[PDB]
């Protein structure tokens, strides 16, 4: 095959770390920057440079709200999903603290949630970190058992960024609503990938980013429910912008880019995620019959774009080196993935795990190249430990 | 020319096309779009290189080590981080903070939040010209004072504080000194290897770089420390977690590179225009300069006009994109200088920049002269002005 043979290397399989900006998004962004464009500050209320800028912000705010079934007034712009996570959890925790100081989250949450919760523990909040099941799913009966009268907040993400597992955010939402608990979802990896309708879903706070959906880095949003009303304390002060919730200049060009990505995503999501899901199954089929490999997560109920695989009887660092033709991630920090460790894998298996994440430039030929490279590489490397021979005995 | 004339560069500036050109290379599939935290592949390594180059360009303008530069989302974030970060870090030493009534709201609203948290804040009144009396700063400084925040250039009236002298007083007493340099960076010279400032805020969009990126300088010698306000992975050496927006960072870097080359020439040109503007309007009766021309940024002119209504003034000048600093409450900075509410209302900030010409200044002088004349012709207030304006207003 012509594509397969003239294959540009390394192959990008790390869309979960960041995505390339869609050419249409970039083109929109370019009109909101120079003296010839709409470069005004939306907060300049006294002249047309400002009004024009405010208008482009309101369009983008509607574009974002339309994807996720919210009212634009529920969308608070932030500098990214890290900030959204900080704002949601510290904002709600501080606002509702006289009602209770107990927070429940998952051990497999992104660090923006975990380190936030750890900071709140310093401040006197008490935090339950729930252990997931081996597949990454939180046991909903364990969640209910942890819920108390002084529980103010639960934070559990839609799609796990390391392993792609999908939590039942609707059921968790129902549990929280019935008890009067604020439910925050980190939807950074699910927005524009799985359907989200906040007019139906019982979620109070939701974090999104631009750069996991072909928008620019350094912009995000937090959805803050108007009905039934949830409040949060601003963490960023300076003029009470975004209805008191987040002060600072609105980076119009960034906001316009995010809105455009979310407009694109609503239109192209269903065809593209079907295509991606086909490609992920194609990848897993090719590699599942290598002996002693393990899928981390859920094949049928996972995100269409993430495949996290553990390879037994090989050494983690030489694995990444063997796969240098691919841009991938092991989740290493050398600490292995705290997420894999939470599922209960030993450190060495956790080290020799690879997240493959797919996106809109990913082809069938890249997948086939990947399959043959993984197969070759695992065979070659296992020929280097006696443990593999000492597996092929007992 | 083109109407309306942009004279609101202090609100935001247009991105320099050199800056935009660089940013465009760090975005799409055929450019450098990777995440610099992606440590295991070249998409990350090449993004990390661009960030390091940008960080070096920023540090070079201001006389710092790049390791002292912490990236943030803007000067609002840098201000919040510096003050809350230093106040929380040093709170066992004391809980007293001194700032100025005329600071940006990013400082003032931050200090008000810290008051809720049990900190004590002194807000110093400036002099009628906007300058802080250093004798009153000194009088306010105690054994339990941990932090002072006094901006370099005021965004509303352009007044320049003696940040070097303030820095000396703070260092001599073991007090942390934070400077909001959002309006001075790329306009006045800053050399942090000489200047005794511990924390310094800057932005990209006040010097022809993109909105939504900024930095905080955090001194490493003698070492200053702050508590992170943004958690999630301990990035920027623990001080600010989150993904590094590489195209934004590259734009800011490039804006700061350009500013180092072009600053001296451009600020001389702007000071000329600022002076040209003031000369043309100073011989209108009953107008007041807010600030101090001698201790004032080269690109800002803030003027109050007596005997006109503020709302009518700004509409009369619709040929200009300017600011009156209203919110309708008048400018809190002007109220802090001592002006009555009406005079504060009928004040205009003219801020100049890269595209401002002598033709635009001349048009502005004429427009202003004619407009004030017209306005004072309505209402017998101006007509009375003669009759012995009956006391107190
Ligand atoms: C990427 C990621 C974040 C951080 O997002 P930024 O916009 O880069 O700060 C938070 N949560 C999840 C699930 C993520 O994948
Ligand atoms: C504009 C400005 C800010 C706010 O900076 P952003 O980058 O827009 O958040 C803070 N301080 C001063 C003096 C400013 O003029």
Author numbering:
A (entry chain B): -5 to 327, 333 to 393
B (entry chain A): 1 to 327, 333 to 398
The article reads:
The cysteine desulfurase IscS is a highly conserved master enzyme initiating sulfur transfer via persulfide to a range of acceptor proteins involved in Fe-S cluster assembly, tRNA modifications, and sulfur-containing cofactor biosynthesis. IscS is a highly conserved, widely distributed pyridoxal-5′-phosphate (PLP)-dependent enzyme, with 60% sequence identity between the enzyme from Escherichia coli and its human homolog, NFS1. The small domain (residues 1–15 and 264–404) contains the critical active site cysteine Cys328.
We have determined the structure of PLP-bound IscS at 2.05 Å resolution in a different crystal environment from that observed previously and have also found the Cys328IscS-containing loop extending away from the protein with its tip disordered. Therefore, IscS prefers an “open” conformation of the Cys328 loop, compatible with sulfur transfer to an acceptor. In contrast, the analogous loops in two other cysteine desulfurases, NifS and SufS, are shorter and prefer a closed conformation, with the active site cysteine residue located in proximity to PLP, compatible with loading of sulfur acquired from bound cysteine substrate. Easily recognizable electron density in our structures indicated the presence of the PLP cofactor as an internal aldimine covalently bound to Lys206, as previously observed. IscS is composed of two domains. Dimerization of IscS predominantly involves residues from the large domain.
